[PDB]
Structure 1
Amino acid sequence: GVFNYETETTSVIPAARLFKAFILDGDNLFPKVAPQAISSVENIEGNGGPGTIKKISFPEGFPFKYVKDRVDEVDHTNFKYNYSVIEGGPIGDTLEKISNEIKIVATPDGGSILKISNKYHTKGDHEVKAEQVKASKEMGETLLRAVESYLLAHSDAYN
């Protein structure tokens, strides 16, 4: 099956700045600002364009050791990022991949919202494991909030 889980996260950070930092520079920021969520991010192949593979490692204790993610598309002006989880972590058993689409939109007050869709490709009619759905929500919050906090503490970053 293909099962879609969506999130709408409100952020006080303006959209262009948040896209530049959180989406396009998380390989740097995530291990820096959220080491208790992500221990390292390593480029595996590619230069950041479509088809680029990276390895995200998690600190010891988490159920998973790593995932490999693939960049699908980046739309720099519309603040849209498409990427897939293709190996490691939850990939195995009845789950083949997670296809993700993130879009950051400005809000009237000058902040932003992140529209997040995670589409899980599972075997047949097998559902996504509830623990995965939960862990994904937790990770997204930890990472976004940590980058937000960094941006608010460092006004000269990503202007």
Structure 2
Amino acid sequence: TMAAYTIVKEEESPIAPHRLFKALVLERHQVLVKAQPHVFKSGEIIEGDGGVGTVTKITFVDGHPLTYMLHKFDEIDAANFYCKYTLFEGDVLRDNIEKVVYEVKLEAVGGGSKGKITVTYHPKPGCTVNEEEVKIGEKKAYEFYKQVEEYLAANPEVFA
């Protein structure tokens, strides 16, 4: 009940993985305002050079329930379309979550991709991970994912 809580998800995309990996990982801070300008106000690198160790800050628009998030890149293997990164700060963590650790892995399937993401919610000591909260966060994450995919399909030159 006070353990970390992990979900794994796999889905195929018609988008080629080099584009999806830039949009969803490496340059996500530069795409999220373009793909979801009704949710995200800004995305920027606040520390680092783009690679391992980089911290990004994403802020939400006014009127959104959330305010900002900081993520750090832990591991990047761009040739294999793999990244581990950690959401380590922000109001979305509320009081009970220490960090959320993400692993993304894509591979080419014909002209598109197969993607796998693992998400691990780490509660603070003496706290628990609330499943309804995870469900709502994951629904919203899945909306972002699908709207990035719809943006890349509508704008085929981007990251091509």
Q: How does the TM-score come out when normalised to structure 2?
A: 0.86
What corresponds to 1:135 in structure 2?
A: 136
What corresponds to 2:48 in structure 1?
A: 46
Aligned in 2, Cα 1:127/1:110: closer, same or farther, shift over 3 Å? farther
Query: Which has more helix, going by share of residues?
Result: 2
Question: Distance between the aligned counterparts of 2:98 and 2:133, measured in 1?
Answer: 13
- Paired amino acid for 1:46: G
Q: Does 1:145 align with 2:115?
A: no
Unaligned runs of 5+ in 2: none
Unaligned runs of 5+ in 1: none
Give aligned pairs, total. Answer: 158
Runs of 4+ in structure 1 deviating by more than 6 angstroms, as ranges, are none
In the TM superposition, 1:20-39 aligns within 5 A as 20-39=22-41
- Paired amino acid for 2:88: I
Aligned in 2, Cα 1:134/1:157: closer, same or farther, shift over 3 Å? same
**Structure 1 residue 92 displacement after superposition:** 4.2
Deviations 1:134-158 (A, max 9, x none): 2332232222222222222222222
Relative to structure 2, which stretch is displaced further, 39-48 or 19-28? 19-28
What corresponds to 1:15 in structure 2?
A: 17
Identity value in percent:
36
- Paired amino acid for 2:114: I
Question: Do the aligned partners of 2:30 and 2:44 also contact (CA within 8 Å) in 1?
Answer: no
What corresponds to 1:71 in structure 2?
A: 73
- Paired amino acid for 2:28: G
Q: How does the TM-score come out when normalised to structure 1?
A: 0.86
Deviations 1:50-77 (A, max 9, x none): 2211111112333321111111111111
Question: Do the aligned partners of 1:83 and 1:100 also contact (CA within 8 Å) in 2?
Answer: yes
